[PDB]
Design a protein around this motif. Structure first.
Motif, PDB file in Angstrom:
ATOM      1  N   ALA C  83      34.966  58.366  34.600  1.00 42.71           N
ATOM      2  CA  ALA C  83      35.586  59.379  35.448  1.00 42.71           C
ATOM      3  C   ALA C  83      35.099  59.274  36.887  1.00 42.71           C
ATOM      4  O   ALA C  83      35.888  59.421  37.829  1.00 42.71           O
ATOM      5  CB  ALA C  83      35.306  60.770  34.882  1.00 42.71           C
ATOM      6  N   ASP C  84      33.800  59.032  37.081  1.00 44.85           N
ATOM      7  CA  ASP C  84      33.276  58.894  38.436  1.00 44.85           C
ATOM      8  C   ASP C  84      33.866  57.673  39.132  1.00 44.85           C
ATOM      9  O   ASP C  84      34.200  57.727  40.321  1.00 44.85           O
ATOM     10  CB  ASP C  84      31.749  58.822  38.408  1.00 44.85           C
ATOM     11  N   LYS C  85      34.015  56.565  38.404  1.00 45.91           N
ATOM     12  CA  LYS C  85      34.626  55.377  38.991  1.00 45.91           C
ATOM     13  C   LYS C  85      36.106  55.591  39.284  1.00 45.91           C
ATOM     14  O   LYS C  85      36.631  55.028  40.252  1.00 45.91           O
ATOM     15  CB  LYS C  85      34.433  54.174  38.068  1.00 45.91           C
ATOM     16  N   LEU C  86      36.790  56.397  38.467  1.00 39.40           N
ATOM     17  CA  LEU C  86      38.193  56.701  38.728  1.00 39.40           C
ATOM     18  C   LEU C  86      38.356  57.532  39.994  1.00 39.40           C
ATOM     19  O   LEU C  86      39.270  57.285  40.789  1.00 39.40           O
ATOM     20  CB  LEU C  86      38.808  57.427  37.534  1.00 39.40           C
ATOM     21  N   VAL C  87      37.486  58.526  40.189  1.00 39.61           N
ATOM     22  CA  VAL C  87      37.549  59.353  41.393  1.00 39.61           C
ATOM     23  C   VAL C  87      37.411  58.488  42.639  1.00 39.61           C
ATOM     24  O   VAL C  87      38.146  58.664  43.620  1.00 39.61           O
ATOM     25  CB  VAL C  87      36.468  60.451  41.344  1.00 39.61           C
ATOM     26  N   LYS C  88      36.485  57.526  42.611  1.00 37.09           N
ATOM     27  CA  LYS C  88      36.249  56.684  43.779  1.00 37.09           C
ATOM     28  C   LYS C  88      37.487  55.862  44.124  1.00 37.09           C
ATOM     29  O   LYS C  88      37.941  55.851  45.274  1.00 37.09           O
ATOM     30  CB  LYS C  88      35.045  55.776  43.524  1.00 37.09           C
ATOM     31  N   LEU C  89      38.060  55.181  43.132  1.00 32.35           N
ATOM     32  CA  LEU C  89      39.145  54.242  43.401  1.00 32.35           C
ATOM     33  C   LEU C  89      40.475  54.947  43.647  1.00 32.35           C
ATOM     34  O   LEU C  89      41.326  54.423  44.376  1.00 32.35           O
ATOM     35  CB  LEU C  89      39.268  53.250  42.245  1.00 32.35           C
ATOM     36  N   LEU C  90      40.677  56.126  43.054  1.00 34.86           N
ATOM     37  CA  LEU C  90      41.875  56.902  43.360  1.00 34.86           C
ATOM     38  C   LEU C  90      41.832  57.462  44.776  1.00 34.86           C
ATOM     39  O   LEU C  90      42.878  57.599  45.422  1.00 34.86           O
ATOM     40  CB  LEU C  90      42.046  58.039  42.354  1.00 34.86           C
ATOM     41  N   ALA C  91      40.637  57.787  45.274  1.00 35.16           N
ATOM     42  CA  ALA C  91      40.522  58.335  46.622  1.00 35.16           C
ATOM     43  C   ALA C  91      40.760  57.263  47.678  1.00 35.16           C
ATOM     44  O   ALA C  91      41.433  57.514  48.684  1.00 35.16           O
ATOM     45  CB  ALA C  91      39.152  58.984  46.811  1.00 35.16           C
ATOM     46  N   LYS C  92      40.202  56.066  47.474  1.00 32.14           N
ATOM     47  CA  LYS C  92      40.460  54.962  48.393  1.00 32.14           C
ATOM     48  C   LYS C  92      41.934  54.580  48.402  1.00 32.14           C
ATOM     49  O   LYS C  92      42.462  54.154  49.437  1.00 32.14           O
ATOM     50  CB  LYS C  92      39.589  53.758  48.013  1.00 32.14           C
ATOM     51  N   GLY C  93      42.622  54.757  47.279  1.00 39.58           N
ATOM     52  CA  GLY C  93      43.971  54.237  47.183  1.00 39.58           C
ATOM     53  C   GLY C  93      43.927  52.741  46.958  1.00 39.58           C
ATOM     54  O   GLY C  93      43.073  52.224  46.228  1.00 39.58           O
ATOM     55  N   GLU C  94      44.857  52.029  47.591  1.00 37.29           N
ATOM     56  CA  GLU C  94      44.982  50.577  47.502  1.00 37.29           C
ATOM     57  C   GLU C  94      45.132  50.083  46.067  1.00 37.29           C
ATOM     58  O   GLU C  94      45.077  48.871  45.825  1.00 37.29           O
ATOM     59  CB  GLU C  94      43.796  49.869  48.172  1.00 37.29           C
ATOM     60  N   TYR C  95      45.318  50.989  45.111  1.00 38.75           N
ATOM     61  CA  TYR C  95      45.474  50.607  43.719  1.00 38.75           C
ATOM     62  C   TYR C  95      46.902  50.155  43.450  1.00 38.75           C
ATOM     63  O   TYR C  95      47.845  50.546  44.143  1.00 38.75           O
ATOM     64  CB  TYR C  95      45.106  51.771  42.795  1.00 38.75           C
ATOM     65  N   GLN C  96      47.053  49.319  42.432  1.00 40.40           N
ATOM     66  CA  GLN C  96      48.367  48.877  41.997  1.00 40.40           C
ATOM     67  C   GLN C  96      48.944  49.862  40.986  1.00 40.40           C
ATOM     68  O   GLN C  96      48.223  50.625  40.340  1.00 40.40           O
ATOM     69  CB  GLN C  96      48.288  47.475  41.392  1.00 40.40           C
TER      70      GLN C  96
END
Ligand SMILES: C#CCCCn1c(C)nc2c(N)ncnc21
Ligand SMILES: C#CCCCn1c(C)nc2c(N)ncnc21
Ligand SMILES: C#CCCCn1c(C)nc2c(N)ncnc21
Ligand SMILES: C#CCCCn1c(C)nc2c(N)ncnc21
Lengths: 261, 261, 261, 261
Positions: C83-96
């Protein structure tokens, strides 16, 4: 002897019923729908089922006959063109009888109801998910999760049991067959999958895990039962008696119904 | 009495066999692999099958025992840790016996061979397409077109029969079950699809239509038969006798093998 | 961006939801359950389904995420420890993002309702027998008699479709799959039996023959519809969008759910 | 253009072939069985398969036609009474073409053979037990134990795939379907059971565990391969091209073959 005739109700079955009654009037035969010894069903297998459940308390004193006015039935297996020949041989008597096994269903609440099934008895949930613990002779066998379960008689194997992948069993075998409806099987939940065939004296028990309301069917009759603690299946000690007026083998009846002609 | 022990051959089953022999040496027990009264199988169900077919001509004089050194088996259903207890109770005798039905297969050519199956007997074609006429009690039931057919004993229902969608039958039921392998069903070709369960004295006959060579299996043994006019299935008059040293219900054996633990 | 989190409601999912919200509070992220761009589901696949149907009108503007607090889910396929790693990468965006096809169901009366299904849509009768005419691209294909029918999305193939014998399809295939529930097949009544896989633009129509009331389900929602003239299935033009934060192949998700671990 | 006609060989197909050749002699058409642009098959689907494999190296330069002299076929889907109309429209040209996907099978030894399948490719063992590891896109998915496996094309789904419980897929879907033959499933051994549908670019790999000899079939051709390290399935980059002379929908072809007429 005393006899009665039930009819599907359409113009065709009613007129055949009136002709057999008139034909019976030429013999020492008495029409009695209260204490009959011969129950003649004219219509289809559904008509035969209603005749069976109508007199399910005098089974040891009744020989049943089925006449199909539509397509061939597994219980209504005589054509209308043989009605005159049936009247003759039923009046003389001296006919042989054959017996098929029946299924006994016991429903227990928190108060206990027993039912007799000629075809099968099914269990499904009332709305929510259907989860039951399957207990075979007091041994916990499986926790079933799916649409429901079906326990069939041998002669009932050609009905709903067949549609669920169950095996066709010759009705001379005193047994019952349990089949599954759309079971959930994954790493967490496990069912046997295969149909199970149980001999006499074996008791299959269904016990709730959460929801205690189930839609229980016995042949055509389907009723919602509330607050049930156990559903109990066993091969009945009672049998249904057919009057045998010639040889129509079960496997030929299966061929004529599913293969050709 | 006279006894013999067969082994899977691995280091584990051989050492358990030598220990039971030495344990039997402390009792009035004689090792005899020619006319034994007790046949002990150590290994798996395949080891038990070979022991059965090794002595299939003294079945009325032998009580079989199975010990599984691997996973639980339906015939080898006793653990190695109970070998010492088995030696004690087999030597005293006074044990009860249980009997399972067997399948009789007759092959006729243009010259007739009979086989005894503990699990099942299968028929497939030798190369070309497999088409046979299925005859039930001298009544033509269907023309089967597909990969092949399988006739199973009740205790064999948990083996290849299960993989083909057949039902699991309690081995106290004297019956046989026919299942299909990959049948062709279309507007032109028709099979019943469902498994068929036959009682004693019912004869199922397979008759060729074109090719008269078939690969016929009986348990583990598979042989190519040429110029066969009929394959004939019937519940055998012979039964296999197990020595019963405690209660291990068949349905529990089914649960332990397919559900859990 | 704007986000919202739905919870199964148990103590475990609620506490994980509060921690992710607090973790999101350390970024340029705004909680909004009215116009979110990221919908996070914490619980199981059922929790994910409710989140999907809650926002089924902003599908082109939302990327979904599923977190399973129980066993692995096909939509909730991320563990709580991430969950902590998801919060980080969802906030940065740039996800596919990845997209799965959906099923469109149209119900017509004598007045027309459309539904979007992520898993499947089923049809059964309300009490009486279930008989419908199956029409494929305006061509009458079969008259179905049985318990009911199921039309599944590709990602829905691992759910009720699997329990009915349907095939598991990779969700990159734009298709729908029709499966049967307990069909009646005899000399008189004929169904295809096999599951049917339809591409885009193919229209499957169900038309009543007698009874015009049916119990229609769409994912978890099940409603009784009265006086319906047609049920109409088609692969939807809309797709559900998942945020892709690493590689978890569908076939691995299938292995982990049904085979092992 | 250049054309050739293959015949089943019976009196009926040969005479229809000679009449079409004579009919083609009235147009600017040249008979050439070496570099044809139109391949006409007269007989059944088996005749069409041989025509396909006869010219499987000029697939991008050939439009196929099937004429059934027996029952309706899925590839030979034109009646003999339309042979004169086919000659006319094939000679004018201007006809549309339709393309079906194909299956590519790669066999690797310790030396690598590739095959093109129009219907399906199956794998079984040569005598002993059949156990393979199933690898999907380099991910170990399952250890299969049973009779064998079948990978089918979309148009092949109506053939052996259907008999094994696989789904019928519209041939416009670029996919392949894997089905199981008599799998062993118990507490120790686990298979998915369900058919699996794979899109393009997905690679399904079968790898031996003990025995390295397998009987591999590709359509009608069945060969024993020894010392194989891998069997590799993938949707082919090549397609078979049919000449489209009117509208005969695939689902209608399915109805006419399995339902009625
Ligand atoms: C209404 C309806 C469908 C079932 C008809 N049916 C009944 C009442 N008994 C049987 C039976 N023993 N075998 C086959 N079909 C049967
Ligand atoms: C080798 C191998 C696979 C089958 C093992 N097996 C045998 C020899 N008998 C049975 C049985 N009665 N029930 C289940 N499994 C069995
Ligand atoms: C509640 C309950 C049983 C079904 C759970 N479930 C859902 C909601 N979706 C799926 C899915 N795509 N694959 C497998 N299982 C699923
Ligand atoms: C010989 C034999 C049995 C199979 C016939 N057959 C072939 C060669 N292709 C197909 C097909 N695509 N669909 C249905 N049936 C088919």
């Amino acid at each position: 002897m005393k006899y009665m005739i039930t009819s599907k109700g359409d113009e065709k079955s009613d007129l055949l019923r009136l002709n057999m009654i008139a034909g019976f009037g030429e013999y020492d035969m008495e029409y009695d729908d209260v204490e009959p010894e011969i129950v003649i069903s004219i219509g289809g297998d559904g008509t035969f089922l209603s005749a069976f459940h109508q007199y399910e308390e005098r089974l040891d004193e009744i020989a049943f006959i089925g006449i199909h006015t539509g397509h061939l039935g597994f219980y209504a297996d005589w054509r209308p063109a043989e009605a005159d020949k049936l009247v003759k041989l039923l009046a003389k008597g001296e006919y042989q009888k054959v017996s098929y096994p029946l299924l006994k269903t016991t429903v227990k609440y928190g108060k206990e109801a027993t039912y007799l099934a000629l075809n099968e008895s099914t269990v499904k949930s009332s709305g929510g998910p259907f989860v039951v613990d399957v207990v075979i002779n007091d041994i916990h066998f499986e926790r079933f999760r799916g649409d429901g379960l079906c326990m069939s008689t041998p002669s009932g194997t050609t009905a709903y049991n067949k549609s669920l992948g169950g095996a066709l069993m010759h009705p001379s075998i005193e047994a019952m067959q349990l089949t599954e409806m759309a079971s959930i099987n994954n790493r967490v939940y496990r069912t046997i999958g295969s149909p199970l065939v149980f001999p006499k004296h074996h008791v299959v028990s269904l016990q709730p895990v959460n929801d205690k309301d189930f839609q229980i069917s016995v042949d055509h009759l389907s009723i919602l039962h509330r607050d049930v603690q156990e559903i109990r299946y066993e091969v009945s000690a009672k049998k249904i008696h057919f009057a045998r007026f010639r040889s129509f083998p079960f496997w030929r009846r299966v061929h004529d119904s599913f293969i050709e002609d």
